[PDB]
Amino acid sequence: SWEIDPKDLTFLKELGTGQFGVVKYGKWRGQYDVAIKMIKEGSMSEDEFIEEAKVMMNLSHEKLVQLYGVCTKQRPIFIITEYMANGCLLNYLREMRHRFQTQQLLEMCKDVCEAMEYLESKQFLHRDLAARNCLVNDQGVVKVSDFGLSRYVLDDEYTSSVGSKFPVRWSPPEVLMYSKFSSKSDIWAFGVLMWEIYSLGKMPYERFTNSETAEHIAQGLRLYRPHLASEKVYTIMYSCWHEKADERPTFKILLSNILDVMDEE
Template identity: 60%
Template sequence: MILSSYNTIQSIFCCCCCCSVQKRQVRTQISLGQDGGLSEKHTQRHRPRGSELSSRKQSNRGCVQPSKRKPLPPLPPSEGAEEKIRVKALYDFLPKEPCNLELKRSEEYLILEKYNPHWWKARDRMGNEGLIPSNYVTENKITNLEIYEWYHRNITRNQAERLLRQESKEGAFIVRDSRHLGSYTISVFIRARRSTEATIKHYQIKRNDSGRWYVAERHLFQSVPELIWYHQHNAAGLLTRLRYPVGLMGSCLPATAGFSYEKWEIDPSELAFIKEIGSGQFGVVHLGEWRAHVQVAIKAINEGSMSEEDFIEEAKVMMKLSHSKLVQLYGVCTQRKPLYIVTEFMENGCLLHYLRERKGKLRKEMLLSVCQDVCEGMEFLERNCYIHRDLAARNCLVSSTCIVKISDFGMTRYVLDDEYISSSGAKFPIKWSPPEVFHFNKYSSKSDVWSFGVLMWEVFTEGKMPFENKSNLEVVEAISKGFRLYRPHLAPMCIYEVMYSCWHEKPKGRPPFAELLQTLTEIAETW
């Protein structure tokens, strides 16, 4: 039997300038042994802590109500807590302004802030900070295919073949997006054998139900980079192993959205005029240089030909339309007359002249690739709710690598020449216009689709004039009665069907550009 009693012992402690009294409980246990004697133990009872204290209070006081105090709200995340994105430079970038940061191809950078979709603030390994063009970098993750030299996202089958033929090495290869969403294609160069010419094989990279990638079903991989690495060392079902990755990284620098962040006004003293390269609806076009190192095209706008104030406001929006298949607007010069429009320079000039100069020399695969480039750019404009209004071969330009880009989108809105906007005027693009435009002046992405069908016709006729023997008035009458352009002899029926679908009388009956692009891609993969 154990008898317990509690005694209180007071002990006094001094702390700094004040004294406190701490009470210490000592428990006296009196044990009654079997022999009837008494023994006494003293144990120090420590001050209970945490949950021990809570449970003891409940046992001493009976049933105690739980605390009704609400838990404290979580602390807000600190500014530095957000995970920074690490990127890899795809191209070299030389600073154009003091606020820019130099990029070196293949090096890693830390993104500090995304000012807008086109310009980001970054830091290099040395701690230097500045603005960089977002289309010059990609997220540095092993699963991100863009960090690999062999991957080409925006490339057609024909462009892939042309690239590999230029390399002309056994096993030279690239990986590109397939026409099937979420899958890829390996294009590989096979050297000439005794009985066969050099050829290019296309192998589809597929994914099985368990999410593993393969070319040959016996060899499965968790990721596309693992698959490519394996086939670089083992043919394993391919005609040759993948020996030489062919890349565009660093060789063809993309245009930036303006020369720097929100720099749309360009000082004319920074422009040098080299030579006249053409003339357009608004005035003379020159090849020039900005700050003596960036090649540009400079359009001098004739006074009275354009509503300049409206255009200057629109230019701020147009600069933000940045895409690999659009001619980039760098800025405008408004400080003196005439007004200058400064754009990306395209070495091979106007698409219409390009087609006519190479008549009989362009394979149908190349002609289809031209249409794919234009369709890709128009799909971007459609997605961003931007209407071109004057899509035609004359308003597309060709780069040094034979990539076609759309130019002068939206410019017709600022023309002051009444003859141009009149359905009876010779300058009005009647032959590229649908009924709702020449009857009611009603523009939309679907009116651009009609014009795209006519552009395809221009491409597959190698630059012929549509309705060449008809006046504008006769064209209006013929189109209104259901007459359409004939099938060019270079265009297979599947291509003509795409053109014809663009010429539906009702805008709603015409396919969107996204659908057209998918159709053209599927055709290209089967040729």
């Protein structure tokens, strides 16, 4: 079921490079748009991924980028997914031409929050939630991408909490100090993502290094309010950053809060 015949693919344009190498845009059976990850040799724990691919193909939600299948009878193996015409959320936010209204920004947060509440319902962690790992389709809908894939990355610079690629700025204190990953580390990262959205893609803690950020966070300092966020929006993002993990909300609660502010604003 998971298995796609690579002969059914027509490759058309390069989309860029990520943690597992090049990704292309193409067509499946002459007709259907798809993105195709061509997994770089040595970048991925391929046999582990392939077993997990079966669980991932049952994750289906309108705000999650859909996995369509894998091509495994070969090397490089390919991962085939839904295509998102406007690319990564971070770069979309940084394009000032969009002149976003705050109602649009809140809708992006709600899109992600729906996807994350679905994952939480399935006890599945993203592990690398950030605007760089959300994608935007041709209707301006945001969807969460590459959830779970951090587990198969072979690169020590990405996996170590002191690596140059580790997502320090998206991590709660208990992840930085003890590697304690949970639903509540996704919640923390979601707060940082809302902050990214409302800051139009500024880097979190933009004047600090990763090392200084970790120390700031441990002393209890936080990101402060983006100019575009109302007080009510800021309360929601700030709630994700409680020092104590069990005092942070769930994605179900966060969704309820976002819907309430949409109605008020």
